[PDB]
Amino acid sequence: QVQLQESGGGLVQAGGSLRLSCAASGFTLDSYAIGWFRQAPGKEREGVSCISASGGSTNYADSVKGRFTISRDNAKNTVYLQMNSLKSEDTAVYYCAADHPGLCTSESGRRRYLEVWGQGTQVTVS
């Protein structure tokens, strides 16, 4: 019942934009850090971005710095990944994750970590 669901994937030309949504259900993400990952074809899972519980800290993989912006809307229980200036190599399945050790949060805190994973939304950049 705790669950993450991604949307916003699409088919776009190089240089275009998308906004991915990571929507929580069965629980509120308000106090949790959220990360985005992707799997490009024939590649290992790549960390894309994360945002801290407060929203005050954000991380980006070097390859997407300046192009992608992560943000959170607690009221909508959703975290967004705005993707501008899309490139061919941004083509991948993208999925989010909530409350994992070292993912824009402490690597070991007191709390048991939720470690929720989503399902995926697909980005194709032609």
List the chain domain ranges.
1-126
- C-alpha span between 25 and 106 (Å, rounded): 24
Name the residue among 38, 21, 39, 2 with its Cα closest to residue 115.
2
The two tokens of residue 21 are: 């949504």
Annotation: CATH topology of 1-126: Immunoglobulin-like (2.60.40)
What's this structure's resolution in Å? 2.2
* Partners of 51 in beta bridges: 34, 58
- C-alpha span between 89 and 55 (Å, rounded): 27
